[PDB]
RNA sequence: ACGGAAGGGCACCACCAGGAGUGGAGCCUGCGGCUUAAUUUGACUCAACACGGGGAAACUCACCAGGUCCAGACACAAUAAGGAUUGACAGAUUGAGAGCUCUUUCUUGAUUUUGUGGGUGGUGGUGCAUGGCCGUUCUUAGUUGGUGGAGUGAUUUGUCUGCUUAAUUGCGAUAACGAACGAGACCUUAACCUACUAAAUAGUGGUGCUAGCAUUUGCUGGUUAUCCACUUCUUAGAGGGACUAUCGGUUUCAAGCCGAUGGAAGUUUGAGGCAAUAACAGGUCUGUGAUGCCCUUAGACGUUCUGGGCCGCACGCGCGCUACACUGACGGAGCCAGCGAGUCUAACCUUGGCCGAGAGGUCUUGGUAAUCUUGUGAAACUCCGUCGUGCUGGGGAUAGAGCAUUGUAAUUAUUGCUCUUCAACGAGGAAUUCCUAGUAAGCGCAAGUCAUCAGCUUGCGUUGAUUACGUCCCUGCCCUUUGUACACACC
């Protein structure tokens, strides 16, 4: 939860665009895959999000799947203040 | 053009039948080719401990992976190659195309 | 780019990865098995199970985000992975389905 | 926890919490007039008008180049 | 912070580890699977390795 | 269960017969003892001790002497943007920009510094929760219903009188008949598929060009498209085999054991894998992110860094290596292996030259891999010389100087090499180890950890003397008899 504003905005927009985060379990690497932020920062932010109850996590051999839920997507929508039918995360 | 269609599978019967249908289709199309050459099947051996810790007699196991490689030398245009690949299809058979 | 010797083992590892992820994340929904089919610029993966509609979910959001899962995991081309669901025939003939049913019964709490 | 006698002096040194002193940023004192701007920042293009060139004891510090700044007069 | 990993972790068993338990002993680099021996024993049937002899 | 109690049935993890180191010496390994900050661990009758693939630079060990970091979350009150960490030059520490830490400042600036029943993590601990996997059971040896019969019954027969067989596999079977599992059964590396396709990774007969011998059939080699029914050296497939064919000897002339004009052998065709209803409080809450339970969450048992540590020596124990010298040290020379191994944010495998007695790289018509290592030129043989009935020339182990490498680091020699110095060892006393095939072993290669090399482990190459059919004395197991006063059932 002690994320920088830029890092948290990047995580929020990546969740809005793709929907799911993949984080190889390597803390303090400071070079995350496809996002410049810290791997440990991403992991801790998503773990606190799960504690809040808005997103689920899977391990699958030290791999950290982060899969969004309805409550998580609605909270993200209210935080980003996006109009309806702008860019849903369940496109075909 | 001297194309080479190469199968890199593990299923022995599947490799045999896909090679058979490829060669029979070539024969019925009456086009020159080379016979299906089989590279010697390679065995990947893993010698690992039966038990996690160091209890009991020293017992090991040899896991084996048999992989079959084969290739047929053909000469066909792209559309004919695509139709050949589409016909007589079977999941798992790994095909690849090279040009010499 | 890879010799076939390492490539076959890599493909086996990828298949094991997909099977283990699906069985770990889909134990509650009654997962049974996975099969694959490779074709040019497309990879189809089919989940053999019982509750096809339930694993589909609402508007298929489950399968859409599962495809995105496999995509961002295995770093393939965007949109070249597609998954479908099929109802297994002879459902009770697989030990995995029987084990999942007994897990469900234990969760219910009968003797 | 048997071979730990803590013979070393008790040296707990939890970091200070930035004790709040009086008002800072003393530019100048002008009554009913414009207070002139001071602290001409570094001419280096790296600085983005965010480094305060405070000269306490004949030294300059820049927060942009965290590793390359060594100047003398 | 760059002071957490000053000691190199580019090579050695610190990096040559499995992807299941992140252990650095009993590892196999043959065929580039980089898996622990017992986890390999568990998952070899689905991976493709079979017991014959 | 227990027998020094009836017995039998077996095992070259035991022998009559005989080979090969261990027990006598020198060394890496693993265990117990001691010191130390630490040499922390688990494992102890075959079922501990080159075991955790655990040869220990640092990484991976948990053990230490030190300074840093939280991932501290239900919900707020207290200084609450005159405001609080992580990233900071400075008198002092420091491989450093670990302002961690004082009169003084900062890249950003609500991302809250504090407290509770929740509890995210852990090489802290229990096989007194155990999964799950292995070993031992039990290695070619044992169990279970259905219908009958005995018995009030729990139960018994079925599952053996006589017995061949490296298995209750079987003939014959007294009350049994009929089925099931283990077993038997299921299979290539161990060929000859000469029915048929199979390597610019093949052949000879001649095919274009070539060096040497008589212009006395041609010869070995070459660049690869410069050839003409093909598979004789290596892979397959609906389908091949040897079923102990066929005969002679022994069995109310019933299983089987043996000798012989032929195929790869006629001991079951070679070795192994998968694998007995049940058990061990056998190993793993201590290389596994299976996890309730007593342990932490402001100097944390998590993590990160430097230097130590499984790398220390009066000591004992087994695996493994080198020897006890015309066989071997040898040296200058001939000709040889099959499975496989090897490069994408990585430039890897020592193929021919230069810096160069060799070790790092400078060019890759060699590598997504039978062709570059590599058809694995090593492991054993033949001309020649010393140790020539040795207080040393076998023994480069037993020490110092130098010549060499990925690695932001190798000192208590990471490893190789060039010299100089044989303090041990003359079939080795009691006990024990492994072995009938082309077997132990004479000896080198491939893969694991790898940064470097194994002596460890999983796979081959030249060959072996006199049993393999024969018993308990010790290493034991099993069955049924027999005796109990036993049920976490002799502990």
UniProtKB/Swiss-Prot annotation, chain A:
* Keywords per UniProt: Cytoplasm, Ribonucleoprotein, Ribosomal protein
Name used for this protein in its record: Small ribosomal subunit protein eS10A
The record's listing under Pfam families reads:
S10_plectin
Q: Does the keyword Cytoplasm apply?
A: yes
How is this protein organized at the quaternary level? Answer: Component of the small ribosomal subunit (SSU). Mature yeast ribosomes consist of a small (40S) and a large (60S) subunit. The 40S small subunit contains 1 molecule of ribosomal RNA (18S rRNA) and 33 different proteins (encoded by 57 genes). The large 60S subunit contains 3 rRNA molecules (25S, 5.8S and 5S rRNA) and 46 different proteins (encoded by 81 genes). eS10 interacts with GCN1 (via middle region); this interaction is direct and promotes GCN2 kinase activity.
Chief subcellular location? cytoplasm
Other comment? Present with 54100 molecules/cell in log phase SD medium. There are 2 genes for eS10 in yeast.
Q: Does the keyword section mention Transit peptide? A: no
Q: What InterPro entries does its record include?
A: Plectin_eS10_N (IPR005326), Ribosomal_eS10 (IPR037447), WH-like_DNA-bd_sf (IPR036388), WH_DNA-bd_sf (IPR036390)
Q: Name one GO molecular function term.
A: RNA binding
According to its record, what are the GO cellular component terms? Answer: cytosol; cytosolic small ribosomal subunit
Q: How is it modified after translation?
A: The N-terminus is not modified.
Single Gene Ontology BP term? ribosomal subunit export from nucleus
Report the superkingdom from the record: Eukaryota
The listed locations are:
Cytoplasm
Family stated for the protein in its record:
Belongs to the eukaryotic ribosomal protein eS10 family.
Curated annotation (Swiss-Prot), chain B:
According to its UniProt entry, this protein's organism is Saccharomyces cerevisiae (strain ATCC 204508 / S288c)
GO terms (BP aspect)? cytoplasmic translation; maturation of SSU-rRNA from tricistronic rRNA transcript (SSU-rRNA, 5.8S rRNA, LSU-rRNA)
| Positions spanned in the full protein | 20 to 119 of 121
Q: Which domain of life is it from?
A: Eukaryota
Task: List the protein's name.
Answer: Small ribosomal subunit protein uS10
Q: Where is this cross-link: Glycyl lysine isopeptide (Lys-Gly) (interchain with G-Cter in ubiquitin)?
A: 2, 13, 82
The similarity comment for this entry is: Belongs to the universal ribosomal protein uS10 family.
Q: What is the lineage of its organism?
A: Eukaryota, Fungi, Dikarya, Ascomycota, Saccharomycotina
Q: How does it assemble?
A: Component of the small ribosomal subunit (SSU). Mature yeast ribosomes consist of a small (40S) and a large (60S) subunit. The 40S small subunit contains 1 molecule of ribosomal RNA (18S rRNA) and 33 different proteins (encoded by 57 genes). The large 60S subunit contains 3 rRNA molecules (25S, 5.8S and 5S rRNA) and 46 different proteins (encoded by 81 genes).
Q: Where in the cell is it found?
A: Cytoplasm
How is the protein altered post-translationally, as described in the entry?
N-terminally acetylated by acetyltransferase NatA. Also partially acetylated by NatC.
Q: Provide a GO CC annotation, any one.
A: cytosol
UniProtKB/Swiss-Prot annotation, chain C:
Indicate where this protein resides in the cell: Cytoplasm
Consequence of mutating residue 105 to E? Impaired ability to rescue stalled ribosomes
The UniProt record lists the KH type-2 domain at 18-89
Q: For the modification Phosphoserine, which residues carry it?
A: 94
**Numbered residues of crosslink Glycyl lysine isopeptide (Lys-Gly) (interchain with G-Cter in ubiquitin):** 103
State the function annotated in the UniProt record.
Component of the ribosome, a large ribonucleoprotein complex responsible for the synthesis of proteins in the cell. The small ribosomal subunit (SSU) binds messenger RNAs (mRNAs) and translates the encoded message by selecting cognate aminoacyl-transfer RNA (tRNA) molecules. The large subunit (LSU) contains the ribosomal catalytic site termed the peptidyl transferase center (PTC), which catalyzes the formation of peptide bonds, thereby polymerizing the amino acids delivered by tRNAs into a polypeptide chain.
Q: Which family does it belong to?
A: Belongs to the universal ribosomal protein uS3 family.
State whether it acts alone or in a complex, and with which partners, per the record: Component of the small ribosomal subunit (SSU). Mature yeast ribosomes consist of a small (40S) and a large (60S) subunit. The 40S small subunit contains 1 molecule of ribosomal RNA (18S rRNA) and 33 different proteins (encoded by 57 genes). The large 60S subunit contains 3 rRNA molecules (25S, 5.8S and 5S rRNA) and 46 different proteins (encoded by 81 genes).
- Recite the other comments: Present with 146000 molecules/cell in log phase SD medium.
Q: Tell me the protein's name.
A: Small ribosomal subunit protein uS3
Gene name linked to the record:
RPS3
Swiss-Prot record, chain E:
CC cofactor note: Binds 1 zinc ion per subunit.
Q: Which subcellular locations apply to this protein?
A: Cytoplasm
A GO MF term: zinc ion binding
Q: Does the keyword Nuclease apply?
A: no
A GO biological process of this protein is: cytoplasmic translation
What cofactor(s) does the depicted protein rely on?
A: Zn(2+)
Q: Return the InterPro entries for the record.
A: Ribosomal_uS14 (IPR001209), Ribosomal_uS14_CS (IPR018271), RIbosomal_uS14_euk_arc (IPR039744), Ribosomal_uS14_sf (IPR043140)
Give coiled-coil spans as residue ranges. none
Binding of Zn(2+): at which residues?
A: 18, 21, 36, 39
Q: Does the record's keyword annotation contain Ribonucleoprotein?
A: yes
Modified positions (Phosphoserine) in chain numbering: 22
Extract one GO cellular component term from the record.
cytosol
Q: Which UniProt keywords apply?
A: Cytoplasm, Metal-binding, Phosphoprotein, Ribonucleoprotein, Ribosomal protein, Zinc
NCBIfam families according to UniProt: PRK05766.1 (NF004424)
Q: How does it assemble?
A: Component of the small ribosomal subunit (SSU). Mature yeast ribosomes consist of a small (40S) and a large (60S) subunit. The 40S small subunit contains 1 molecule of ribosomal RNA (18S rRNA) and 33 different proteins (encoded by 57 genes). The large 60S subunit contains 3 rRNA molecules (25S, 5.8S and 5S rRNA) and 46 different proteins (encoded by 81 genes).
What further fact does the record state?
A: Present with 6490 molecules/cell in log phase SD medium. There are 2 genes for uS14 in yeast.
Q: What family is this?
A: Belongs to the universal ribosomal protein uS14 family.
Which protein is depicted?
Answer: Small ribosomal subunit protein uS14A
UniProt gene name? RPS29A
């Amino acid at each position: 939860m002690l994320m920088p504003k830029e890092d948290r905005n990047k995580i929020h927009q990546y969740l809005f665009q793709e929907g799911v985060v993949v984080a190889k379990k390597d803390f303090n690497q400071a070079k995350h895959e496809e996002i410049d932020t810290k791997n440990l920062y991403v992991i801790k932010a998503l773990q606190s999000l799960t504690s809040k109850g808005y997103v689920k996590t899977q391990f699958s051999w030290q791999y950290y799947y982060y899969t969004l839920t309805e409550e998580g997507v609605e909270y993200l929508r209210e935080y980003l203040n996006l109009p309806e039918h702008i860019v849903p995360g369940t496109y075909i | 053009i001297k194309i080479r269609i190469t199968l890199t599978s593990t299923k022995v019967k599947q490799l045999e039948n896909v090679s058979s249908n490829i060669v029979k289709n070539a024969e019925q199309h009456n086009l020159v080719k080379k016979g299906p050459v089989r590279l010697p099947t390679k065995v990947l051996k893993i010698s690992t401990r039966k038990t996690p810790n160091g209890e009991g007699s020293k017992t090991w196991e040899t896991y084996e992976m048999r992989i079959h490689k084969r290739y047929i030398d053909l000469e066909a245009p792209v559309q004919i190659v695509k139709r050949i690949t589409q016909i007589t299809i079977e999941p798992g058979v790994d095909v690849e195309v090279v040009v010499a | 780019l890879i010799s076939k010797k390492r490539k076959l083992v890599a493909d086996g590892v990828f298949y094991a990865e997909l099977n283990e992820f699906f069985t770990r994340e889909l134990a509650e929904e009654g997962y049974s098995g996975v099969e694959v089919r490779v074709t040019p610029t497309k990879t189809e993966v089919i989940i053999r199970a019982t509750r096809t509609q339930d694993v589909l979910g609402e508007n298929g959001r489950r399968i859409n985000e599962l495809t995105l899962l496999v995509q961002k995991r295995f770093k393939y081309a965007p949109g070249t992975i597609v998954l479908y669901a099929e109802r297994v025939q002879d459902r009770g003939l697989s030990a995995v389905a029987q084990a999942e049913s007994m897990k469900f019964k234990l969760l219910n709490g009968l003797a | 926890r048997k071979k730990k006698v803590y013979t070393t002096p008790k040296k707990i040194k939890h970091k200070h919490k930035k004790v709040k002193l009086a008002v800072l940023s003393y530019y100048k004192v002008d009554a009913e007039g414009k207070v002139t701007k001071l602290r001409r920042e570094c001419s280096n293009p790296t600085c983005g008008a965010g480094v305060f060139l405070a000269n306490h004891k004949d030294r300059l510090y820049c927060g942009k180049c965290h590793s390359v700044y060594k100047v003398n007069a | 912070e760059n002071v957490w990993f000053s000691h190199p972790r580019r090579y050695g068993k610190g990096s040559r580890q499995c992807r299941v338990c992140s252990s650095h002993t009993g590892l196999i680099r043959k065929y580039g699977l980089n898996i622990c021996r017992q986890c390999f024993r568990e998952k070899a049937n689905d991976i493709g390795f079979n017991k014959f002899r």
